[PDB]
């Protein structure tokens, strides 16, 4: 029942050309759905999921102009930050932005987001109150003030409580059979011959969606964090994710070792052992 939308904007300046590259990416429930890239031949927001092809030309023209506006905004900002941190010319710099809204299962606005980062580092953010700002760097205070004295917060607050919510609704409707899915985990275990009298047990979780998942190895006592080795959750490239966690076990003494897979689109945690 919980939903969300996010636009992750980025602008990078290189010693390169006279101008920044600006990329905007939109997500609904964590999946890319639109995209703008100033590097394209014909810079425009393009649909990124089939369900979006519904929006007529008016929609894409509008968003496109918004994009060009943002690009200008990032260009002036990149310029100012440069002065704020007294960085000279001939460097690379990044300015990033995340903004959007989160709705609970009842489709009501749970929280708005609007934070900026410079050089990968937090620069200024709009507090959940949608009224006050947080900015740690001494350099960021200049921006804080400017924005405070100019009512920026009211402006973003409005967007977050209004459009961000209202459109996400419209989007969620136009994509019910596409993004209402959870691809359940199909888990298995592999045996791997190790140091004499010790074998490695690998618990695999494949083709699940969304990415969030957890794996544990209960020697079935109740607990094992005993140098259990795993990997970050990864893209399979097909829309699903993969993961695995393993543990060193006495060859033979290895059925009393169970793996648990908690994933959401799953009735109950999955429970498995080894199986020829």
């Amino acid at each position: 029942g919980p939903h969300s939308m996010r636009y992750f904007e980025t602008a990078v300046s290189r010693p390169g050309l006279e101008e920044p590259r600006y990329i905007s990416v939109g997500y609904v429930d964590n999946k890319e759905f639109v995209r703008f890239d100033s590097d394209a031949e014909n810079p425009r927001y393009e649909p990124r999921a089939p369900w979006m092809e519904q929006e007529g030309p008016e929609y894409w023209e509008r968003e496109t102009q918004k994009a060009k506006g943002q690009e200008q905004w990032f260009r002036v900002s990149l310029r100012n930050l440069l002065g704020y941190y007294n960085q000279s010319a001939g460097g690379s710099h990044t300015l990033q932005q995340m903004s959007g809204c989160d709705l609970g299962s009842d489709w009501r606005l749970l929280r708005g987001y609007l934070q900026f980062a410079y050089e990968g580092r937090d620069y200024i953010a709009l507090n959940e109150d949608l009224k006050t700002w947080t900015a740690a760097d001494m350099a960021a205070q200049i921006t804080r003030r400017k924005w405070e004295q100019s009512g920026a917060a009211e402006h973003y607050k409005a967007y977050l409580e209004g459009e961000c919510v209202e459109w996400l609704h419209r989007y969620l409707k136009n994509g019910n059979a596409t993004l209402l899915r959870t691809d359940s985990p199909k888990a298995h275990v592999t045996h791997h011959p190790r140091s004499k009298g010790e074998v490695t047990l690998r618990c695999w979780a494949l083709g699940f969606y969304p990415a969030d998942i957890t794996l544990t190895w209960q020697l079935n006592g109740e607990e094992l964090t005993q140098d259990m080795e795993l990997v970050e959750t990864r893209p399979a490239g097909d829309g699903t994710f993969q993961k695995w966690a393993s543990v060193v076990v006495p060859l033979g003494k290895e059925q009393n070792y169970t793996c648990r897979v908690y994933h959401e689109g799953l009735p109950e945690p999955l429970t498995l052992r080894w199986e020829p």
């Binding site: 636009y7 905007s24 506006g69 704020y84 900026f116 921006t143 400017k146 924005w147 100019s150 459009e163």
Partner: peptide, 9 residues
């Protein structure tokens, strides 16, 4: 719908 910024930095 995309947000649109207010005051620049």
């Amino acid at each position: 719908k995309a947000v649109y910024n207010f005051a620049t930095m």
